[PDB]
Amino acid sequence: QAPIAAYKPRSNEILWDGYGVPHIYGVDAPSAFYGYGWAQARSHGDNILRLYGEARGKGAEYWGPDYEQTTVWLLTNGVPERAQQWYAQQSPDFRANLDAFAAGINAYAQQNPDDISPEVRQVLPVSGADVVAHAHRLMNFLYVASPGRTLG
Amino acid sequence: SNSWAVAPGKTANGNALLLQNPHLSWTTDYFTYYEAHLVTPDFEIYGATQIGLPVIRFAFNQRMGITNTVNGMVGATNYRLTLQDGGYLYDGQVRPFERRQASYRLRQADGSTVDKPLEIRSSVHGPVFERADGTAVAVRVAGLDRPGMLEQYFDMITAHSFDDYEAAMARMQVPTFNIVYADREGTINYSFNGVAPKRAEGDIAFWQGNVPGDSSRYLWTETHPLDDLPRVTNPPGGFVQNSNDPPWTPTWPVTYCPANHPSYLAPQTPHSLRAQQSVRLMSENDDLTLERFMALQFSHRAVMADRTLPDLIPAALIDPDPEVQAAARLLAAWDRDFTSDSRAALLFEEWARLFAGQNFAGQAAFATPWSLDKPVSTPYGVRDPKAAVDQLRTAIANTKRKYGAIDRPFGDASRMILNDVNVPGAAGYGNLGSFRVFTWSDPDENGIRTPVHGETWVAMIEFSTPVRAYGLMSYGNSRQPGTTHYSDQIERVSRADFRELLLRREQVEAAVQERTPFNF
Numbered sequence: 001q002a003p004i005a006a007y008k009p010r011s012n013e014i015l016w017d018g019y020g021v022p023h024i025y026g027v028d029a030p031s032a033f034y035g036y037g038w039a040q041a042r043s044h045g046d047n048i049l050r051l052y053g054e055a056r057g058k059g060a061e062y063w064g065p066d067y068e069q070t071t072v073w074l075l076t077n078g079v080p081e082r083a084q085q086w087y088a089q090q091s092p093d094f095r096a097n098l099d100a101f102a103a104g105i106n107a108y109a110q111q112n113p114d115d116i117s118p119e120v121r122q123v124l125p126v127s128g129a130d131v132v133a134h135a136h137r138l139m140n141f142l143y144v145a146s147p148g149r150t151l152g
Numbered sequence: 153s154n155s156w157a158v159a160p161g162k163t164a165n166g167n168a169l170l171l172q173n174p175h176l177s178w179t180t181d182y183f184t185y186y187e188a189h190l191v192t193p194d195f196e197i198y199g200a201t202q203i204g205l206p207v208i209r210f211a212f213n214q215r216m217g218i219t220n221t222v223n224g225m226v227g228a229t230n231y232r233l234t235l236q237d238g239g240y241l242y243d244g245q246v247r248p249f250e251r252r253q254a255s256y257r258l259r260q261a262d263g264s265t266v267d268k269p270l271e272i273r274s275s276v277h278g279p280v281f282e283r284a285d286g287t288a289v290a291v292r293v294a295g296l297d298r299p300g301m302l303e304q305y306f307d308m309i310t311a312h313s314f315d316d317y318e319a320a321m322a323r324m325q326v327p328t329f330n331i332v333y334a335d336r337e338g339t340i341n342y343s344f345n346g347v348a349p350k351r352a353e354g355d356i357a358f359w360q361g362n363v364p365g366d367s368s369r370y371l372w373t374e375t376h377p378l379d380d381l382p383r384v385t386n387p388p389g390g391f392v393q394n395s396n397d398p399p400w401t402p403t404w405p406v407t408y409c410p411a412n413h414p415s416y417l418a419p420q421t422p423h424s425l426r427a428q429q430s431v432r433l434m435s436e437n438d439d440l441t442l443e444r445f446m447a448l449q450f451s452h453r454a455v456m457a458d459r460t461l462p463d464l465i466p467a468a469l470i471d472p473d474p475e476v477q478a479a480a481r482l483l484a485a486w487d488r489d490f491t492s493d494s495r496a497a498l499l500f501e502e503w504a505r506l507f508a509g510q511n512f513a514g515q516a517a518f519a520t521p522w523s524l525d526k527p528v529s530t531p532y533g534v535r536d537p538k539a540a541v542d543q544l545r546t547a548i549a550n551t552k553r554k555y556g557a558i559d560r561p562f563g564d565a566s567r568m569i570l571n572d573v574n575v576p577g578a579a580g581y582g583n584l585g586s587f588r589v590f591t592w593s594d595p596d597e598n599g600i601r602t603p604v605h606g607e608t609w610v611a612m613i614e615f616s617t618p619v620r621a622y623g624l625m626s627y628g629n630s631r632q633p634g635t636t637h638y639s640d641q642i643e644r645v646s647r648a649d650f651r652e653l654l655l656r657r658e659q660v661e662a663a664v665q666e667r668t669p670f671n672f
């Protein structure tokens with residue numbers, strides 16, 4: 001009839017299973033997002049930071065030529081600036097979860113500097129807007145409007 | 153990508169069933185899925201999502217769950233500009249461009265960064281780019297004023313009822329995707345979601361190409377509400393599905409047709425064979441169990457074979473070339489399923505590449521064209537068997553060259569290799585009819601090939617109480633250098649041996665291998 005009673009976590013912790021699947025438990029939303037951000041940095045930190053870097057339109061700056069086309073594509077479409085706006089336009093509650101997520105990533109890099117690849121260290125620290133930027137790039141400038149269809 | 157949602161009435165235990173089956177590149181970084189589980193006193197979410205997203209796109213919990221496939225919502229327009237006098241011709245007059253002088257730094261091979269100028273010109277349409285051929289194009293992207301994408305997904309997956317769920321979707325903050333829903337209450341739903349520009353003329357094909365950028369006539373400004381988009385809820389069939397096929401067979405019997413929506417929403421092209429298998433596998437089966445449901449997902453039928461071999465074989469057998477004859481007999485004995493041991497599969501593929509083009513979508517060679525009136529049994533037959541036999545002749549050459557023989561075991565050439573794990577492959581190209589998908593790469597010098605795209609995150613959920621779920625991630629849950637969680641799941645994928653997804657605390661505590669306490 002009614003769903004099984006929910007779990008009421010009394011402390012913030014990540015319980016990782018045998019396959020590297022993180023079970024993030026938080027006493028509140030921000031805590032869980034922070035945990036989620038930590039886990040992701042643990043499992044895919046290098047590529048996330050690199051992608052976030054690109055979303056800032058800093059691809060060409062941080063890594064040169066091979067990232068210049070995307071930089072031009074994102075700047076010309078004002079993605080990094082619109083990301084700032086979207087971030088600012090978030091409801092206070094959700095913006096708090098985004099800040100927490102970025103804080104979790106920063107935190108992980110802080111406690112485990114050896115796990116972060118040299119080339120992507122300059123990206124740190126990441127911010128909530130970075131999280132918004134990337135998502136904005138993935139949805140509107142990869143899925144919906146790919147640079148391929150515009151340029152050919 | 154595949155997606156299935158089964159209504160209680162179509163199952164044995166009376167609980168809804170959901171399949172999360174997104175297909176994406178195994179190597180593109182921003183397409184890598186991650187599996188996670190979030191729990192707070194007010195909500196719980198389990199599922200996969202692209203790395204970097206703070207929200208789970210493919211989620212489920214004890215109450216509901218959703219999945220996503222690509223619908224290609226044409227949410228942007230590329231306009232061809234008519235340059236003239238430093239500006240561009242618009243409505244009979246020469247309009248000036250908006251110009252902003254920006255810049256960015258380019259890292260040099262020596263570590264320094266040079267400052268590079270970047271001018272950004274915009275028309276009333278949007279940013280302007282110049283193609284390599286010289287065509288000035290302006291791209292207008294719809295939904296640039298929808299900042300709530302992330303929170304919409306968050307509210308959708310934490311919804312306490314279908315009603316709240318829809319309400320969240322109705323905000324129109326997620327610009328694209330087909331989305332399927334199912335809950336413990338018994339509701340299932342399909343939604344052709346996205347932000348679609350309101351237009352007064354032109355079919356999707358017109359808007360997919362270069363629209364004239366010299367008239368206000370093509371400057372859209374509004375977008376469709378959720379109620380203008382194709383959707384299905386609790387249909388008579390007891391299920392909904394989508395495998396990237398146009399939204400015209402989301403269920404069976406259908407609940408609408410192309411005429412009911414503006415022609416620029418989605419295409420009206422022939423449904424892939426995989427898409428057809430999808431409709432058949434669900435409609436043809438009743439009283440499903442979670443296990444049976446899972447078993448159906450493993451379907452790897454060479455549907456293309458059932459549509460062509462009856463005509464090809466006899467024609468090939470009369471060819472003078474004894475090797476063409478042997479190839480014909482080899483293909484004739486094949487059970488038309490992409491199994492590891494199939495000695496005919498590779499050969500069939502090579503012929504298929506010619507008979508239906510490299511992507512296997514070509515339609516020109518069938519005797520009976522596709523028809524929405526027979527959506528899962530057309531196209532059919534070989535139009536020119538003589539030609540087809542020549543194509544087979546060439547295919548024999550190609551198969552021997554690529555793999556070393558015309559009868560090499562499919563699973564001997566098709567391998568799934570991650571780190572030092574090397575397991576035998578099965579299933580294959582979706583356009584040939586294989587539901588479970590593995591888009592094999594071209595082979596190397598030894599004829600070995602691996603998945604370039606296809607099955608990634610795969611989960612099947614039964615919304616019982618408590619819920620029961622199984623899943624697998626092809627390339628593991630991590631790609632950080634030296635991680636042991638990259639190649640530790642591919643061996644199970646090769647045996648379709650799924651892990652039970654653990655949602656209950658007691659289950660989690662039993663399987664914990666690492667505890668990371670934290671503080672925010």
Ligand SMILES: O=C(O)CCCC(=O)O
Pocket residue numbers: 153174175176209220221222329396
């Ligand atoms: O929604 C996604 O995660 C993208 C995969 C869908 C597809 O390519 O069909």
